[PDB]
Design an enzyme around this catalytic site. Sequence first.
Site, short mmCIF file in Angstrom:
data_model
loop_
_atom_site.label_atom_id
_atom_site.label_comp_id
_atom_site.label_asym_id
_atom_site.label_seq_id
_atom_site.Cartn_x
_atom_site.Cartn_y
_atom_site.Cartn_z
N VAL A 20 0.87 -1.18 0.06
CA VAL A 20 -0.04 -0.07 -0.10
C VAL A 20 0.88 1.27 0.09
O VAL A 20 1.55 1.53 1.03
CB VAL A 20 -1.11 0.02 1.40
CG1 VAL A 20 -1.81 1.41 1.05
CG2 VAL A 20 -2.02 -1.14 0.94
N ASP A 21 1.02 1.95 -1.21
CA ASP A 21 1.91 2.92 -1.49
C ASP A 21 1.14 4.20 -1.87
O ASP A 21 1.11 4.40 -3.22
CB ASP A 21 2.68 2.48 -2.68
CG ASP A 21 4.21 3.49 -2.73
OD1 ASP A 21 3.97 4.62 -2.15
OD2 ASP A 21 4.97 2.92 -3.31
N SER A 22 0.74 5.31 -1.12
CA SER A 22 0.48 6.38 -1.46
C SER A 22 1.19 7.44 -2.18
O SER A 22 0.66 8.45 -2.87
CB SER A 22 -0.25 7.01 -0.12
OG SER A 22 0.88 7.68 0.57
N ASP B 22 3.89 9.84 1.73
CA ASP B 22 4.24 8.51 0.97
C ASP B 22 4.20 7.45 1.66
O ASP B 22 5.18 7.34 2.43
CB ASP B 22 5.53 8.67 0.40
CG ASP B 22 5.88 7.76 -0.60
OD1 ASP B 22 5.13 6.89 -0.65
OD2 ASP B 22 7.06 7.81 -1.09
#
EC number: 3.4.23.-
Lengths: 128, 120
Positions: A20-22, B22
């Site tokens: 899970v990489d915003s 991030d």
Amino acid sequence: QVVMLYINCKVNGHPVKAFVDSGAQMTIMSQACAERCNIMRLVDRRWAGIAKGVGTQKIIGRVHLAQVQIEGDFLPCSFSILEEQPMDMLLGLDMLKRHQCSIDLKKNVLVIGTTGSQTTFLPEGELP
Amino acid sequence: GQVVMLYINCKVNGHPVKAFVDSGAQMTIMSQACAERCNIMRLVDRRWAIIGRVHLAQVQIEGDFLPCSFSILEEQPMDMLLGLDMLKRHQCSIDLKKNVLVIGTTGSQTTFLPEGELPE
Ligand SMILES: [Cl-]
Ligand SMILES: [Cl-]
């Protein structure tokens, strides 16, 4: 020693651990995982070589629509296929935003905005 | 087919910083230019290195001063990358339905910046 964010999901009934990489612009599945999930037939190879982010591997194509199962939810997703990737699946901001998700680090859950369904982040012992 | 990346306004030592959020970044990083601009080079432990490490500095989000630790990168395009280390320490939520970063240690929240308000 910070544990990265993973969830369990399924594609086409096949179990997938998704990173899970915003900060990733595009959701990406490895070719190995697309093959294992039996979805190569969905890979539009006319998108070979289209990538938004720098990397070290070629883009094989683009899956315009596949359902990513999280708990009871089937989420319609779009994603590109990288020839190789460390993890099977990288869940990036495109799909996190598509499903209006919440990355809740206090509860250690990913919330699916649509439905309020929740799935727990994986402990270190269950990371790939 | 054109995704706006997650930034927040914050302040370091009174200086405005637009922070890239991030969840896939293991460590919080500030550029050397930004560390200079924020007048916090005094806090950069150069024995680490990546130019050094700031062990403890207040990062201000809305009305809160949050103790953070971060490393300093000789050139980062972006001034600041808020990584999973700090998002976890402050028990934050990245709420993309509400479009806010929730600060779990205080209950505060701050909006992700619109496209027109992003750096570069
Ligand atoms: Cl597409
Ligand atoms: Cl300034």
